[PDB]
Amino acid sequence: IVKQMFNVDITYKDDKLRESVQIQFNFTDVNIERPQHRNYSQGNKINLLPNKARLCGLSYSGPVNLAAEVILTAHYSNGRQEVKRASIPPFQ
């Protein structure tokens, strides 16, 4: 779903030769690791056993890590075009 289905290609309009900006990005990285809990805030985050979640009211949720490729392309007046591209590191 994340990779194939959620591709974004929209164009928005707001140096006076610039009329619109075409935002294009797509995710190619997604993994769901096991639930984690941060013990004393400054911890390395540790495994969250189900009973700990049940007793503390925490949600047995594993973090989702994402990484995307982004293409910011600006279309100017009279057809001049510039492309800004970035490789975005895996975040969560």
């Binding site: 013990n39 540790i46 495994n47 056993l49 700990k52």
Partner: protein
């Protein structure tokens, strides 16, 4: 600081498992800490560090109590 850490650690299933294995091997008393002073002893034996030492550093899952029998798993 130490209070929230004590609550969180006391509530982990891992703490219960390590403490009961320590009780089996007779390192911690089979009472449940009656007065804070023995609670520090139980924490130190079960987890491996005093709570202040746990807060000091950032590597907590290894010094947990290990069985003092080293059974021949063969």
């Amino acid at each position: 600081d130490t209070k929230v850490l004590l609550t969180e650690i006391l509530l982990d299933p891992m703490y219960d498992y390590a403490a009961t294995v320590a009780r089996i091997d007779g390192s911690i008393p089979m009472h449940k800490p009656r007065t804070p002073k023995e609670a520090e002893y139980e924490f130190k034996t079960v987890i491996g560090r005093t709570p202040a030492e746990l807060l000091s550093q950032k590597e907590f899952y290894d010094k947990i109590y290990t069985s003092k029998y080293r059974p021949d798993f063969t």
